[PDB]
Amino acid sequence: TKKSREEIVKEILGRANPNNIPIVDEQPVKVSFKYSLQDIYTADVGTDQVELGLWLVISWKDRSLSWSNECTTFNELTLPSKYIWLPHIEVYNSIGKPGIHSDQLVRVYKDGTVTFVPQYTIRFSCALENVTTEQGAACTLKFGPWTYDVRDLVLDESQQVDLTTYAGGERFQLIEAKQKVNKKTYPCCPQSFEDIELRVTFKKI
Amino acid sequence: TKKSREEIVKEILGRANPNNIPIVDEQPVKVSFKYSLQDIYTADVGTDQVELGLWLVISWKDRSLSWSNECTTFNELTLPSKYIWLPHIEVYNSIGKPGIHSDQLVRVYKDGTVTFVPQYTIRFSCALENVTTEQGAACTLKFGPWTYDVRDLVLDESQQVDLTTYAGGERFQLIEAKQKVNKKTYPCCPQSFEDIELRVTFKKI
Amino acid sequence: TKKSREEIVKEILGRANPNNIPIVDEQPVKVSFKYSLQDIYTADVGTDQVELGLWLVISWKDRSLSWSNECTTFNELTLPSKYIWLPHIEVYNSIGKPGIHSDQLVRVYKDGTVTFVPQYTIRFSCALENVTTEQGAACTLKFGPWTYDVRDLVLDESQQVDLTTYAGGERFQLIEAKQKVNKKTYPCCPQSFEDIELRVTFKKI
Amino acid sequence: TKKSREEIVKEILGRANPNNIPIVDEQPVKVSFKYSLQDIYTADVGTDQVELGLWLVISWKDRSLSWSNECTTFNELTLPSKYIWLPHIEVYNSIGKPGIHSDQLVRVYKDGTVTFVPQYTIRFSCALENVTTEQGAACTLKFGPWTYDVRDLVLDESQQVDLTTYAGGERFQLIEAKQKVNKKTYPCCPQSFEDIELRVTFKKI
Amino acid sequence: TKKSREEIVKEILGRANPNNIPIVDEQPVKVSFKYSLQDIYTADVGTDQVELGLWLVISWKDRSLSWSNECTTFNELTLPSKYIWLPHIEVYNSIGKPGIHSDQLVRVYKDGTVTFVPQYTIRFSCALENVTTEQGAACTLKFGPWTYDVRDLVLDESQQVDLTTYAGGERFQLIEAKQKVNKKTYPCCPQSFEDIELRVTFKKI
Amino acid sequence: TKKSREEIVKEILGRANPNNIPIVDEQPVKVSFKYSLQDIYTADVGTDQVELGLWLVISWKDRSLSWSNECTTFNELTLPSKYIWLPHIEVYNSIGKPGIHSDQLVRVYKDGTVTFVPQYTIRFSCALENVTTEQGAACTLKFGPWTYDVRDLVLDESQQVDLTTYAGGERFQLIEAKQKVNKKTYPCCPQSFEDIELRVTFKKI
Amino acid sequence: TKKSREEIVKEILGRANPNNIPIVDEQPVKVSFKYSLQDIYTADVGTDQVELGLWLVISWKDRSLSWSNECTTFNELTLPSKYIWLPHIEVYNSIGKPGIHSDQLVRVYKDGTVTFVPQYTIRFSCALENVTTEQGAACTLKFGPWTYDVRDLVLDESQQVDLTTYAGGERFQLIEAKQKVNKKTYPCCPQSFEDIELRVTFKKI
Amino acid sequence: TKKSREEIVKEILGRANPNNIPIVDEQPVKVSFKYSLQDIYTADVGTDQVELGLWLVISWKDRSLSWSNECTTFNELTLPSKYIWLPHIEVYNSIGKPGIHSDQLVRVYKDGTVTFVPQYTIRFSCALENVTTEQGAACTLKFGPWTYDVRDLVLDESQQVDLTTYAGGERFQLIEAKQKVNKKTYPCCPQSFEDIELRVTFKKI
Amino acid sequence: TKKSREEIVKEILGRANPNNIPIVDEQPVKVSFKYSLQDIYTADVGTDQVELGLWLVISWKDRSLSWSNECTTFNELTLPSKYIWLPHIEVYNSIGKPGIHSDQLVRVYKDGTVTFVPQYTIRFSCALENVTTEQGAACTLKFGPWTYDVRDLVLDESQQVDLTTYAGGERFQLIEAKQKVNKKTYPCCPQSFEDIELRVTFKKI
């Protein structure tokens, strides 16, 4: 459509950079992570797995170069996620491969900021037992870079959990959704690793 | 200028081939796609459209014939995009026709590989809401052949998203840019289609 | 078969364009979307997911160049969807990856118009409860570009929903199928995003 | 093994042609289609889907060039289906992606004729109801090029349906299998499209 | 590790040959096939499908060239199956795509002999009925090149079936496992095709 | 981010080496294997398959070259597993393809040591019978290079099995987890092969 | 044993190459040389000869052709040294013909790399005088291609000398073992020749 | 002599097989090794070498083909060792080339088993010191395939060491002879290698 | 390595000539002989034999044919001595067979000139008596073709003897080394025979 926009895409995609961390100076890359819990689709007592429909908000800043003098033009362009590098964030205890609800498209900004929000259905281990009870049940899943240590990737969160999107007539009510950031160590490695633990406590309405 | 170069252009352009997929054997054509997010130019709250200045790196191999014995000569020639066939890749949800920042020139190589990188300004649907907040906002746009199914065209990406080019003093910071490849189906057709979802998560500095 | 047709394909595919939005001027790309609800295959009470067999009519105009003087020739050619860029349109709340009923083939026209209709089976969240009752049940799913904001992609619809194709002896009767276009905002982004909300109200015969 | 055979493969594969319809003159490509119904594996009442194990006989003629003078040599060579272009024929109403029983190998002949027969398991919509009854039940599925109109691809069938292969002790008896060719129109397009409607009427033994 | 070994791999992989049958003289390629029935995992009465865990022993000789004078060195090297051509052998009546238990690694020998043994879980059609009875039940599945006729590929077997590996406490007892080679004709083609029919007769312990 | 780190990745990835065993001298590659049994998710009596959630610790040393004088810099870098060669270790009797919980990221060290730990869900054959009983049940699965003989790959283990990670409120209690290394021979080959047999004995709490 | 391995040997040995340097392009062949000094067996004062038990690590890359598509197979095969060409490396001042401790077997790798390590007992000229003294005695022997000039063969060494293998209770202690590469000229020929000078300094414990 | 025997030799020798490992399936070849220590002939204090008169029992199974129907005939035939392939087993630390006491004749059996027992005099490094003392002295020598890794060749031993044959009035008494099998690794290669370590502890009577 | 070099070897070795004196015209072949006395290793009073470490420089011209037009290519190639004919020169009074220090490699030149230099240890008769005395002792050994008369082979020498190489700290000092050519007659034959008499006069330092 717009020629101005067209040059933007081409310049960044063609000339700008291959998979590599563009930032030479000592700076780790921080990725903000937010969860919007859309719905708790199902619970399996025998399996002890629960399914969550979530969208993950991920934001990071990449270094981009401005070759052509930027003029008032197309500020944000949308591109497929494949085009650019994305973070490794994954659920530590997912029973199965997560499925993707939405297309992989990411908006990029001139400053270099990128916003990618996938929609996912994830199955993770959690005992459903006592969902019916008033107390309800609690489940926790931790998300975080598999490979990256705290040094390489720093995870940050704005708030606890986004309930607002939550479906009004979901099978299960949400007593409370929390996303607490924590740093933890593994026997594999001396480096600290940061993950966000999403603890959802819910019960049947 | 160089006579040697001159013959090259003429031979490929004049004799070599019309719009047709030169590859007879069963081979789909794969096109690598990469996005270099130059900048997020603007956000419109009322419109709920965002503008991205991106350049798209597109690479594909075409079959070419070498008539004259190739001697050490002009390895890569540049020609207008109109001269050769280009892929259909388009943004699924662009509010307006994309504009083209750069001239349509593509470098071609003797092996037949072609590299075309347009610069674009694209306006796509995305809610700006909560850009100011720390969490930021997420936008997704998917790019992919409109017509071509996975069989005909296969899309590949090297990395997530190229932040490096991103303008240092852009209005919006890039929390993270991702390009995830995904295959999806449409009710129109039983064939799988592949698109790259570019998910950019960004916020105001 | 026809040589004339053959040149057409080659010219557009080989020379014409890579994944990039060919439209330089300020024009968003509008994609018309239509749904033909073939059948409501199944409902799962425990899962609270419903399966729809639909075909999606998608139309868009791409800019193409006519190098060789067009003579009376092959007006529309069919090509795999992979060959050309396709839009990102996806169901917001699909429980699982959609499957593709039909091959990914898209008809293209000289004007540049492209018509792609995939057939899909989609599973989306919806409570089946009270299907048996006379009132029936209502389900809604929204389709729209994930990444693209209203600026980049504009969605349009001709009519409400195509019932005619609907299987005569389907398990569930269709009380009414509607496709209303709506523009909505997300906290991620200040841009407006447009989606088509498909609201189907059906009950067991 | 045989050098003579070896040259054949290489010549056709390497030099002979890329995905393109080799036939310049005005000739549509006709593809004969035949179904050998191996067995009706299962019926799902709740799902209203039925599974068929079939092999599809597909024959078409491609234009090949004979460079080296053909001498008495290897008349038919077998190659992977990926190597050469295959038709888009797909089931219009398949609930899920078809699975492939056999390897994708196709025999090619010097005349250019190609015979490809895949074995498939297909799940398509059909109500099982009253399978037990003497009348039995009827199901229909139509196969045909998704993209190709009658102009581009013409479908032909030799006979009604091949019962002989049918498993002797199948769960369901075959009252009659028919493959009638029909041409139909769609609202999308003014062109006629041809499909083969496979109507199988079967009951439990 | 060993430099000597390293050259071996590189020479064969890099220089030695592309997918092509290296044997120019009139020689068909014979592939020995053996089945080691590990276990009969499950039976489905409704589905009428049975699952077998088997590993397939496949041996064939490929022509290799010895460039560097072979010295006492690494006699057999292991490489991924993708690296070299493998035979098309597939189960004629598999209900679903077979899954692969083991990594695809194949040992190659200087003489050119190659041994590849995949582990598979295969689901094929077979009525479970009367498994409980003393007589037990019989199932047959035939394996053989899909594309290749007897001329191109000849199948050979050393013995009937390898029971020894069979799990001691399997759900089902093996009354007898047989692998008889047979040549058969199809209406598609005048050429004879050879397959190995694996007939297993088993019952519940 | 850090330029120093950036050069490291590029040098190793771009210049350092293709899939090949870098070690010329006579040295087999030893891979240490450790299992951290996260949880026994489920048992299927009919199927006789059990599901384990495990993460596999794999360590090996690869030969790397230091071109640029290493200065105090980024000691360990994380990269995708695809980038570097990984071992073939697979479960001998997995009923289905294992799924991957975590992203494929591997930390590499300057010495050349590499640590890769995937998280997996694996389904393997094992009779659940008598889980309820006090004695409990025993299951064994062996892991080891499919292709590689003891000569090429040597497997080593530090300890028996890592219980500590085991979920506190898992459906099944762990009576004892053991990983014993054993060398075994197959009729296919005269070479010894080494595998680690993971024998887990567990019961319902 | 393994058929796959068997083909490998045969292909390389039978078809691949006669004594000839397979490398047409201008490339010299480099042979890495390493010494593992096993033990200083004896010293003869009258003779002024010393005996060393060493194994020589020799690595070189030969060009091999891969005819049959390499599949995951036997990566390294062992063959007798007679089968393949070996380098001429010899001790310049050996009093007697060296004897061979080990069988002449060499491991070869697919890449073409070959690793051959003979064990030798060599007697070379060196005065034993003052072995008893604290200073000890020094001996030097140079190894290198007799015929080959630097152009044809290039010698390389990884490290100084491998002491680790050295027998703990050897008659003589090793003060230091060094292998320095040097290029030298001879009056016979204008070409430079490269040899590795092994200088061992040892004394009686 | 016997015609029946004569055909046997000719058939195996002439038609049956060249140096190649006849076993295609994945089977390593195991060679049992046994030592019969006939006598410790001499000890050299200055040399620090000891001489052993031993006969080595070597057994292996080769694959043979039975063309002519075997009738009751000559079960075992004797042939020269040169006629058939023999294993590489050699002493790791032999000071000099071993000499052969007996003719190289090997008995072969119809099953394919071969028994070859050479008589050898071997000189290996070992300090004689303190032979006179009551404690005596210990020497160790390891035997094993030079080239073959554990994968290719597996070594097995029935018992510790055969003292019975030991000469009654030998110069040295045998305190204990042991043959322990061990697997070891070398820096050259990642593969494990197996050798039998013969540790003899003896003293002067 | 170099293809150009490769052809050279093959042409001369394969096509050029068998053991035969290529020179038809009346020309005797002259062989220049030079001695480089490396060291006088030992003297045996009882034996009256002395050992010399020498290298013999031998040069001769052979007639070669240039088939392919020689282009600037590999001027000198190295080949094993076995490949080409070498002269019979031997020591008249050697007590034992000479041993060979170096590999038998000979450099050949396009003109046809060949340079072969073996390193030898030779034991010849000579009384050691009075080595200690100041006068020292003299020894003589004559070298020359055994069979060839002066007519067939002519021996020539450039200089007396090459002392420079002589080891600095040899057991014996060299008072003077001379190589005088002489022609002598034997009672066997009327033809004159030419030999070089190497007279070395040496004493203990």
Direct distance between the N- and C-terminal alpha carbons of chain G, in angstroms, rounded to an integer: 49
- Amino acid found at G6: E
Cα–Cα separations (whole angstroms), residue F198 to F86, F91, F172, F181, I73: 21, 10, 17, 9, 62
Closest CA to C82 of H146, B27, H36: B27
Inter-chain touch H21–F193, beta carbons under 8 Å? no
| Partners of residue F25 in chain G, C-beta under 8 Å | 34, 57, 59, 115
Own/partner contacts of D96-99, CB < 8 Å, gap of 24 or more, are D96/C99, D96/C121, D96/D123, D97/B190, D97/C99, D97/C100, D98/D122, D98/D123, D99/E95, D99/E96, D99/E97
Q: Compute the nearest-CA separation of C97 from chain D (Å).
A: 11
Distance separating alpha carbons of residues D180 and D157, to the nearest angstrom: 8
- Is the dihedral angle over the CA atoms I9, G109, G165, F59 positive or is it negative? positive
Q: Compute the nearest-CA separation of G157 from chain F (Å).
A: 12
Contact B22, D18 (CB under 8 A): yes
Give me the half-sphere count of Cα atoms (radius 13 Å) on the Cβ side of residue B198: 47
| Partners of residue C103 in chain D, C-beta under 8 Å | 88-90, 145-147
| Partners of residue A171 in chain C, C-beta under 8 Å | 48, 127
Residues of C with CB under 8 A from a CB of A: 20-29, 46-49, 88-97, 125, 127, 145-149, 152, 188-189, 191
Q: Compute the nearest-CA separation of H144 from chain F (Å).
A: 13
Pick the residue from chain H with its C-alpha nearest to E76.
Answer: H152
Pick the residue from chain F with its C-alpha nearest to H156.
Answer: F192
Q: Which of A1, A79, A119 sits opposite C23 (nearest CB)?
A: A1
Distance separating alpha carbons of residues B118 and B99, to the nearest angstrom: 10
Distance separating alpha carbons of residues H22 and G5, to the nearest angstrom: 10
Radius of gyration over alpha carbons of chain F, in Å?
19
Q: What 3-state class would DSSP assign to F144?
A: strand
Distance separating alpha carbons of residues D58 and A118, to the nearest angstrom: 41
Burial A7-39 (b: 16+ CB within 10 A, else e): bbbbbbbbbbbebbbbbeeeebbbbbbbbbbbb
Q: Compute the nearest-CA separation of D59 from chain E (Å).
A: 10
SS3 content of chain B, % helix, strand, coil (to 5): 10, 55, 40
> E44: part of which helix (H) or strand (E)?
strand E29-44
- Amino acid found at F131: V
E48: left (phi over 0), alpha (psi -120 to 50) or beta: left
> E3: part of which helix (H) or strand (E)?
helix E3-10
Distance separating alpha carbons of residues B54 and B50, to the nearest angstrom: 12
> B54: part of which helix (H) or strand (E)?
strand B49-61
**How far is C-alpha I36 from the geometric centre of its chain's CA atoms?**
10
Touching pair H, G by Cβ (3+ pairs < 8 Å): yes
Distance separating alpha carbons of residues E185 and E193, to the nearest angstrom: 6
Inter-chain touch C96–A121, beta carbons under 8 Å? yes
Cα–Cα separations (whole angstroms), residue B114 to B55, B108, C23, F172: 16, 4, 21, 57
Radius of gyration over alpha carbons of chain I, in Å?
19
* Chain E interface disruption, residue of D78, D163, D205, most E CBs within 10 A: D78
Cα–Cα separations (whole angstroms), residue D92 to C38, D45, H153: 11, 20, 58
Dump strand ranges (E) for D145-188.
153-156, 172-186
Contact H55, H119 (CB under 8 A): yes
Distance separating alpha carbons of residues F19 and F82, to the nearest angstrom: 11
Burial D57-70 (b: 16+ CB within 10 A, else e): bbbbbbbbeeeeee
Distance separating alpha carbons of residues I203 and D162, to the nearest angstrom: 106
Cα–Cα separations (whole angstroms), residue D7 to C188, D2, D12, E19, F205: 60, 9, 9, 13, 67
Q: What 3-state class would DSSP assign to A108?
A: strand
Contact G70, E103 (CB under 8 A): no
Contact F191, H28 (CB under 8 A): yes
Distance separating alpha carbons of residues H177 and H34, to the nearest angstrom: 12
Distance separating alpha carbons of residues D5 and E102, to the nearest angstrom: 34
The two structure tokens encoding residue B31: 């096109």
Contact E59, E115 (CB under 8 A): yes
A187's CB contacts (< 8 A; 6+ apart) are: none
B90's CB contacts (< 8 A; 6+ apart) are: B143, B144, B145, B146, C19, C20, C21, C22, C29, C60, C62, C84, C85, C86, C87
Distance separating alpha carbons of residues G199 and H5, to the nearest angstrom: 60
Distance separating alpha carbons of residues E140 and E136, to the nearest angstrom: 14
Inter-chain touch E21–D4, beta carbons under 8 Å? no
Question: What is the phi/psi pair of residue G98, to 5°?
Answer: -70, 150
SS3 content of chain A, % helix, strand, coil (to 5): 10, 50, 40
Distance separating alpha carbons of residues G204 and G128, to the nearest angstrom: 10
Contact B167, A112 (CB under 8 A): yes
Contact I186, I60 (CB under 8 A): no
Contact I61, I113 (CB under 8 A): yes
Burial D104-132 (b: 16+ CB within 10 A, else e): bbbbbeeebebbbbbbbbbbbbbbbeebe
Dump strand ranges (E) for chain F.
29-44, 49-61, 76-80, 90-91, 99-100, 105-109, 113-116, 119-125, 137-144, 153-156, 172-186, 189-204
Q: Number of residue pairs across B and C with CB atoms under 8 Å?
A: 528
Closest CA to I62 of I108, I103, I106, I104: I108
Contact C1, D26 (CB under 8 A): yes
Touching pair E, A by Cβ (3+ pairs < 8 Å): no
Pairing status of strand A137-144 against strand I137-144: unpaired
Tell me the residue length of chain A: 205
Contact G82, E86 (CB under 8 A): no
**How far is C-alpha C155 from the geometric centre of its chain's CA atoms?**
10
Inter-chain touch I6–G22, beta carbons under 8 Å? yes
Pairing status of strand G99-100 against strand G119-125: antiparallel
- Amino acid found at G54: L
Q: Compute the nearest-CA separation of E42 from chain D (Å).
A: 17
Contact D170, C127 (CB under 8 A): no
* Chain F interface disruption, residue of A93, A142, A148, A191, most F CBs within 10 A: A93
Inter-chain touch H190–F21, beta carbons under 8 Å? yes
> F7: part of which helix (H) or strand (E)?
helix F3-10
The two structure tokens encoding residue B6: 């001159």
Give me the half-sphere count of Cα atoms (radius 13 Å) on the Cβ side of residue F121: 21
SS3 content of chain D, % helix, strand, coil (to 5): 10, 50, 40
Inter-chain touch E23–D39, beta carbons under 8 Å? no
Distance separating alpha carbons of residues I106 and I58, to the nearest angstrom: 10
| A44: β partners | A49
Burial E79-114 (b: 16+ CB within 10 A, else e): bbbebbbbbbbbbbbbbeebbbbbbbbbbbbbbbbb
Please count the other Cβ atoms lying within 10 Å of the Cβ belonging to residue C4: 17
> G33: part of which helix (H) or strand (E)?
strand G29-44
Cα–Cα separations (whole angstroms), residue F160 to F194, F197, I175: 16, 10, 75
Distance separating alpha carbons of residues B126 and C146, to the nearest angstrom: 8
Please count the other Cβ atoms lying within 10 Å of the Cβ belonging to residue B1: 6
Pick the residue from chain E with its C-alpha nearest to D166.
Answer: E93
Distance separating alpha carbons of residues F194 and F182, to the nearest angstrom: 6
Distance separating alpha carbons of residues H47 and G41, to the nearest angstrom: 7
Q: Which of G3, G101, G115 sits opposite H188 (nearest CB)?
A: G115
- What are chain B's partners, defined as 3 or more CB pairs within 8 angstroms? A, C, D
What is the stated resolution of the deposited model, in angstroms?
6.0
Distance separating alpha carbons of residues E32 and G3, to the nearest angstrom: 9
Burial H159-186 (b: 16+ CB within 10 A, else e): eebbeeebeeebebebeebebeeebebb
Inter-chain touch G4–H24, beta carbons under 8 Å? yes
> D114: part of which helix (H) or strand (E)?
strand D113-116
Cα–Cα separations (whole angstroms), residue H187 to D121, E46, H144: 53, 58, 17
Dump strand ranges (E) for chain H.
29-44, 49-61, 76-80, 90-91, 99-100, 105-109, 113-116, 119-125, 137-144, 153-156, 172-186, 189-204
Residue A48: DSSP 8-state: T
Distance separating alpha carbons of residues B24 and D64, to the nearest angstrom: 10
Direct distance between the N- and C-terminal alpha carbons of chain F, in angstroms, rounded to an integer: 49
Q: Which of E6, E57, E107 sits opposite F24 (nearest CB)?
A: E6
Pick the residue from chain C with its C-alpha nearest to A109.
Answer: C189
Contact D24, C4 (CB under 8 A): yes
Contact G40, G202 (CB under 8 A): yes
Residue position matching structure tokens 């092999």: D55
Closest CA to B142 of B122, B158, B159: B122
Please count the other Cβ atoms lying within 10 Å of the Cβ belonging to residue H144: 26
Residues of A with CB under 8 A from a CB of C: 1-6, 9-10, 38-39, 41-42, 53, 57, 76, 78-80, 99-107, 115, 117, 119, 121, 167, 169, 171
Contact B125, B138 (CB under 8 A): no
Give me the half-sphere count of Cα atoms (radius 13 Å) on the Cβ side of residue G149: 17
- What are chain E's partners, defined as 3 or more CB pairs within 8 angstroms? D, F, G, H
Contact C124, C50 (CB under 8 A): yes
Convert chain C into a string of H (helix), E (strand) and C (coil).
CCHHHHHHHHHHHHECCCCCCCCCCCCCEEEEEEEEEEEEEEEECCCCEEEEEEEEEEEEECCCCCCCCCCCCCCEEEEEECCCCCCCCEECCECCCCEECCCCEEEEECCCEEEECCEEEEEEECCCCCCCCCCCEEEEEEEECCCCCCCEEEEECCCCCECCCCCCCCCEEEEEEEEEEEEEEECCEEEEEEEEEEEEEEEEC
- Amino acid found at C70: E
Distance separating alpha carbons of residues D60 and D84, to the nearest angstrom: 12
Closest CA to G157 of F25, F112, F61: F25
Inter-chain touch G101–H88, beta carbons under 8 Å? no
Q: Number of residue pairs across A and F with CB atoms under 8 Å?
A: 93
Contact C37, C54 (CB under 8 A): yes
Q: What 3-state class would DSSP assign to G47?
A: coil
Question: What is the phi/psi pair of residue H201, to 5°?
Answer: -120, 120
Contact F45, F102 (CB under 8 A): no
Q: Which of D10, D41, D107 sits opposite E47 (nearest CB)?
A: D41
List the Cα angle I143/I147/I150 in 5-degree steps: 75
Residues of F with CB under 8 A from a CB of H: 21, 23, 25-30, 148-154, 183, 185-194
Tell me the residue length of chain E: 205
- What are chain I's partners, defined as 3 or more CB pairs within 8 angstroms? G
Give me the half-sphere count of Cα atoms (radius 13 Å) on the Cβ side of residue D194: 18
Contact E89, E145 (CB under 8 A): yes
- Is the dihedral angle over the CA atoms D33, D39, D45, D47 positive or is it negative? negative
G160: left (phi over 0), alpha (psi -120 to 50) or beta: alpha
Pairing status of strand D153-156 against strand D29-44: parallel
Distance separating alpha carbons of residues F58 and F35, to the nearest angstrom: 9
Inter-chain touch E59–H25, beta carbons under 8 Å? yes
| Partners of residue D188 in chain C, C-beta under 8 Å | 57, 115, 117
Distance separating alpha carbons of residues H143 and F6, to the nearest angstrom: 50
- What are chain F's partners, defined as 3 or more CB pairs within 8 angstroms? A, E, G, H
Pick the residue from chain H with its C-alpha nearest to F193.
Answer: H151
Closest CA to G117 of H125, E3, H85: E3
- Amino acid found at G46: G
| Partners of residue F22 in chain E, C-beta under 8 Å | 1, 6
Pairing status of strand D113-116 against strand D153-156: unpaired
- Amino acid found at F168: G
Inter-chain touch E111–G10, beta carbons under 8 Å? yes
The two structure tokens encoding residue B124: 């796509």
Tell me the residue length of chain D: 205
| Partners of residue H28 in chain G, C-beta under 8 Å | 1
Contact E102, F144 (CB under 8 A): no
C192's CB contacts (< 8 A; 6+ apart) are: B44, B45, B46, B47, B48, B49, B125, B126, B127, C149, C150, C183, C184, C185
Distance separating alpha carbons of residues B63 and B69, to the nearest angstrom: 16
Q: Compute the nearest-CA separation of G190 from chain H (Å).
A: 36
Touching pair D, C by Cβ (3+ pairs < 8 Å): yes
